[PDB]
Design a binder for this molecule. Structure first.
Ligand SMILES: CC(=O)N(Cc1ccc(-c2ccc(C(=O)O)o2)cc1)Cc1ccc(-c2cc(C(=O)O)nn2-c2ccc(Cl)c(Cl)c2)cc1
Length: 121
């Protein structure tokens, strides 16, 4: 029952209720660098809770080594221990991941879990 490994409903919680105390378990679907220029890279993540995906996650720069040393990569399952929500001038919310754990490596999971659908706002 693989979707049982993920915090189904956590993305709605974060976006609808603004719940910041949960420590949800999410799957990384994709990771991409953003254009930064003369400052450290920043990574944007498409994450799943098993029900929804959400594309507006960003990694705190302190966690960059996780991506660069390939421990945090597509398909891995993570627990988020600390995150902040920030809102852009245009109204979009960005979820900044400040502390997380990898609970299962990409290589140990191997696939996108379930069939999550994009969260709409
Ligand atoms: C002002 C603000 O709210 N920003 C977030 C933000 C807040 C806080 C910390 C923060 C706090 C602590 C730390 C840390 O420790 O690192 O970081 C980070 C980001 C700045 C910002 C915003 C947009 C981008 C960007 C660019 C590119 C690109 O090129 O393609 N795309 N985006 C982008 C566009 C839309 C979304 Cl929904 C997302 Cl997730 C990213 C980029 C930046």
């Amino acid at each position: 029952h693989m979707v049982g490994q993920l915090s189904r409903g956590a993305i709605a919680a974060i976006m609808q209720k603004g719940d910041t105390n949960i420590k949800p378990i999410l799957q990384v679907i994709n990771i991409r660098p953003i254009t930064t220029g003369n400052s450290p890279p920043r990574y944007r993540l498409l994450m799943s809770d098993g029900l929804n995906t959400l594309s507006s996650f960003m990694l705190a720069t302190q966690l960059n080594p996780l991506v660069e040393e390939e421990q945090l990569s597509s398909n891995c399952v993570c627990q988020i221990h600390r995150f902040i929500v920030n809102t852009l001038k245009d109204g979009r919310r960005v979820v900044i991941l400040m502390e997380l754990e990898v609970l299962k490596s990409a290589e140990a999971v191997g696939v996108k879990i379930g069939n999550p659908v994009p969260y709409n706002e």
